[PDB]
């Protein structure tokens, strides 16, 4: 519970290459020197003022990241610099080598996923969310990019809640301020909307207003009726789940616990086979 104990990462971790493209920023594929073991290393410049806002970031990952549907925290390191600034802070976590769900859709023929795959991943997203929510934590950024796979087909979450506004596509209507929603408040239920959009992403290859300029999409999310699956091919349980996820008014939107009982998530006989199916796609590196 102090930045002084934090070792120099020197003979402990090596930075191999920047992970993904630059999707996550300064997140690197790291190597544990001694074991050769892989870790994901998040690098950040740290000032004398950033010292207390960062002590919590570490404690968040320490407390909450010890669930199977959350990428495990390993440790923290400071790469010191001369008295004329600026120290680097390395947040070492589990390296989910199979990439993200975005990678999965892009790597899958025709950029669509099998319905039973959506059911599997969505259950694991919800199961991870249930953990954050039960600990009074809102993820704030549920999307394909932020849902990763291990080489063991385990579904794991990243990026739970500085100057910029990011991508609008997965934002629940309530988090976007307009005339009747002036103080736009994040609810636990916002992560459920985002989850529903992630399921559309998994189904169609991209989220509902991907073709719009981000500013135009930001404007449309609170005005447009709930997004719907384009195809009619989908099962009744799937449209139903998307519907439940995408209740426009958060006040009637179901809890993460209620969703976990939805027939699409609850009823999964191919669960074991799907995990094997996903493992083989991963094996095709
Ligand atoms: C805390 S954060 O900055 O949001 C963050 C967010 C994500 C990761 C992370 C990314 C990857 C990864 C992604 C794509 C790919 O192609 C290959 C690998 C694997 N494991 C991870 N833990 C790490 C920190």
CA distance linking residue 58 with residue 91, whole number of Å: 8
Q: Is 21 annotated as a binding residue?
A: yes
Largest CA distance in the chain: 63
Tokens of 172: 């629940």
Is the shortest distance between the CB of 154 and ligand 1 below 6 Å? no
Write down the residue that tokens 């449209």 correspond to. Answer: 239
Per the rule left: phi > 0, alpha: psi between -120 and 50, beta: everything else, 140 is left
Ligand 1 pocket, residue 61 CB under 6 Å: no
Tokens 């999964």, residue?
A: 268
Question: Which residue is closest in CA terms to ligand 1's atom 1?
Answer: 159
Rounded CA separation 214/216 (Å): 5
Which helix (H) or strand (E) covers residue 278, if one does? Answer: helix 271-283
Nearest residue (by CA) to ligand 1, atom 23, is: 40
Distance from residue 156's CA to the centre of ligand 1 (Å): 10
Return d(Cα 34, Cα 16) in angstroms, integer.
Answer: 15
Element (H, E) at 17: strand 13-18
Among 224, 257, 263, 211, which Cα is nearest to 242's? Answer: 263
Query: Atom 4 in ligand 1: which residue has the minimum CA distance?
Result: 159
Distance from the alpha carbon of residue 130 to the mean position of ligand 1, in angstroms: 21
Q: How far is CA 215 from CA 168, 171, 194, in A?
A: 8, 12, 18
Among all chains, which residue has been given the structure tokens 């559309």? 200
Return the ligand 1 atom nearest residue 141 CA: 4
Phi/psi of residue 31, nearest 5 degrees: -120, 135
Helix (H) or strand (E) holding 37: none
| 231 dihedral zone (left: phi>0; alpha: psi -120 to 50; beta) | beta
Catalytic residue among 141, 179, 191, 211: 141
Strand 155-157, strand 87-94: pairing: unpaired
Q: Identify the CATH homologous superfamily for domain 1-95.
A: Phosphorylase Kinase; domain 1 (3.30.200.20)
Angle in degrees, CA 243, 246, 249, rounded to 5: 120
**C-alpha closest to that of 159 among 246, 266, 242, 60:** 60
Nearest alpha carbon to residue 216 among 169, 163, 170: 169
Q: Is 141 a catalytic residue?
A: yes
**Is the backbone of residue 241 left (phi > 0), alpha (psi -120 to 50) or beta?**
alpha
Angle of helix 190-204 versus helix 115-134 axis, rounded to 10: 160
Q: Please report which residue ranges of 32-150 form alpha helices under DSSP H.
A: 51-64, 101-107, 115-134
Question: How far apart are the two ends of the chain, measured CA to CA in Å?
Answer: 39
Return the domain boundaries, the chain. 1-95, 96-285
State the distance from the centre of ligand 1 to the C-alpha of 154, rounded, in angstroms. 14
In short, whether 92's Cβ falls inside 6 Å of ligand 1 is no
| Total residues found in the chain within this entry | 285
Distance (angstroms) between ligand 1 centre and the Cα of 96 equals 7
Preceding omega of 86 cis (within 30 degrees of 0): yes
Q: At 280, list the tokens.
A: 């083989």
Q: Is 244 annotated as a binding residue?
A: no
Distance CA 157, CA 65 (A): 9
Name the residue among 109, 147, 106, 104 with its Cα closest to residue 129: 147
The sheet carrying 27-32 orders its strands as 13-18, 27-32, 38-46, 87-94, 73-79
Instruction: Specify the ligand 1 atom closest to the Cα of 91.
Output: 1
State if residue 100 touches ligand 1 by the CB under 6 angstroms criterion: yes
CA 195 – CA 279 distance, rounded (Å): 23
User: After what residue numbers is the chain broken, C–N > 2.5 angstroms?
Assistant: 161
User: How far away, in angstroms, is 147 Cα from ligand 1 center?
Assistant: 9
Q: DSSP letter at 70?
A: B
Is 72 assigned a ligand-binding role in the annotation?
Answer: no
Burial string for 54-66 (b: 16+ CB within 10 Å, else e) reads: beeebeebeebbe
Residue 19 annotated as binding site: yes
Beta bridge partners of 30: 15, 39
The first and second tokens of residue 232, run together, are 């009619």
Tokens of 218: 């930001």
Elucidation technique = X-ray
Indicate which residue's Cα is closest to atom 14 of ligand 1.
99
Is residue 24 part of an annotated ligand binding site? Answer: yes
Q: 96-285 has which fold?
A: Transferase(Phosphotransferase); domain 1 (1.10.510)
Resolution in A: 2.9
Helix (H, G, I), strand (E, B) or coil at 265: helix
- Cα separation of 175 and 209, whole Å? 17
With 0-12 / 13-18 / 19 or more C-beta atoms within 10 angstroms meaning exposed / middle / buried, residue 22 is exposed
């Amino acid at each position: 519970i102090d930045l002084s104990s934090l070792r120099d990462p020197a003979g402990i971790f090596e930075l191999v290459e920047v992970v993904g493209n630059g999707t996550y920023g300064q997140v690197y594929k790291g190597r544990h020197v001694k074991t050769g073991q892989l870790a994901a290393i998040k690098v950040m410049d740290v000032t004398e003022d950033e010292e207390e806002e960062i002590k919590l970031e570490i404690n968040m990952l320490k407390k909450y990241s010890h669930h199977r549907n959350i990428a495990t925290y390993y440790g923290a390191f400071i790469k010191k610099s001369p008295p004329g600034h600026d120290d680097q802070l390395w947040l070492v976590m589990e390296f989910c080598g199979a990439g993200s769900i975005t990678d999965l859709v892009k790597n899958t023929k025709g950029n669509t996923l099998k319905e039973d795959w959506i059911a599997y991943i969505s259950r694991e997203i919800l199961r991870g969310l249930a953990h954050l929510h039960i600990h009074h934590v809102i993820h704030r950024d549920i999307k394909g990019q932020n849902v990763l796979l291990t080489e063991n087909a385990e579904v794991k979450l990243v990026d739970f809640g500085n100057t910029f506004i990011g991508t609008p596509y997965w934002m629940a209507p309530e988090v976007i301020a307009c005339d009747e929603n002036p103080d736009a408040t994040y609810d636990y239920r916002s992560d459920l909307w985002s989850c529903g959009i992630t399921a559309i992403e998994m189904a169609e290859g991209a989220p509902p207003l991907c073709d719009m300029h981000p500013m135009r999409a930001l404007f449309l999310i609170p005005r447009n009726p709930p997004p719907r699956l384009k195809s009619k091919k989908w099962s009744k349980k799937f449209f139903s789940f998307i519907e439940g996820c995408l209740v426009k008014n958060y006040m009637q939107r179901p809890s993460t616990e209620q969703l976990l009982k939805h027939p699409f998530i609850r009823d999964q006989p191919n669960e074991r086979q799907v995990r094997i199916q996903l493992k083989d796609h991963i094996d095709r590196t």
